[PDB]
Amino acid sequence: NLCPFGEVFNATRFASVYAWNRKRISNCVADYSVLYNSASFSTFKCYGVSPTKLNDLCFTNVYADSFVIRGDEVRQIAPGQTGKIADYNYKLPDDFTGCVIAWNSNNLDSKVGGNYNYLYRLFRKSNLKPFERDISTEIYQAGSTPCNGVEGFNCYFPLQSYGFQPTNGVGYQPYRVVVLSFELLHAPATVCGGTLEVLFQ
């Protein structure tokens, strides 16, 4: 019944941002063996909450949303941003309360010749609402011609491959992103009743 924070940050594979993953962390105790430091993350920003709320889940569920984007797109994982990622892929509310963690993953998510396994949505009829997830693959109609059969040059498959190559500049390297949001509970979790003594006897 340890909180699987280690699984979130050390996961072998991450989701594409258009199909971003959500993991629920609940009714568990903090894992006193898991540690990250300044060198681990390139960003660790909280909005309207102190990250110490992650330590006690007695009245809290934590939701960890994770995915891979470009270094120069991490700035879009913030309240009130625009751009392809915030508009069409993963949108934080204007009143967002939670934390955003990101780190350079060039050493895991790039490879010689390019890694193309990660995708993002390039076209959409309207902007996502906060925390909306759109994994559809309907053909996108960019012109006046409808899209039927193979008709229509201006008809577009809406998902786009990143191409992460290891020698790209840092702004075009892949970054893993974890968004942490907090659910206030009304009844105490069963876990409620994992102590600093575990490290000191």
Place this chain on the structure above:
Amino acid sequence: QVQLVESGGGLVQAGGSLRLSCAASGFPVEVWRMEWYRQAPGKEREGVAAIESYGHGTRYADSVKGRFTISRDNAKNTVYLQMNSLKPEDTAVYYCNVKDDGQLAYHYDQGTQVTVSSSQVQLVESGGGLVQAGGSLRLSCAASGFPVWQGEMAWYRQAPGKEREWVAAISSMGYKTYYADSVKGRFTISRDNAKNTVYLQMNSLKPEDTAVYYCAVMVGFWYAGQGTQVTVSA
């Protein structure tokens, strides 16, 4: 590095056929939508046909429907335009294009002629140094993004190649402290809420205390700073 090379053009009588080749180097042809355009005399460029990534489909301008076929050989990294039943209105320079959407980061996007007849969360340690055995030091940990009062704070140390070793901790919203047996009596952990800072007072230092010392807050996972070097000489 990244190159698209068009070929296949020529001068043919109305009703004949051609096959254009777009040979690509520096990326796999199948990962992005690939496209054929043409610019006819006296007109602007026109999209002719496109083949989406993988098996997501093909597209054709109505003017070439039933006459042109676009295809892709992954092994040869080439996109083809098979043109049958050519008409004079197909006369044009034909061009290849990759829809990388800027993912070929350093590739800025010749043709073939066809003629038909809010706060950052961070901890920063300081106070380390080189001292004589028996001496003292005081490490400071300046915290940003959270109140030190609200967290369990701790110090650990790590000698290179060795295993990290917890040294001291202080309880969240409280005053209970904990110490490794190895440092009891010599080390004292304390918290200044006004300065959002935690300290490690180290007395009677031993050469065995040599290590990088880190401060850390418990936020589900431990989150620690950058470390400060403590070296004790006998």
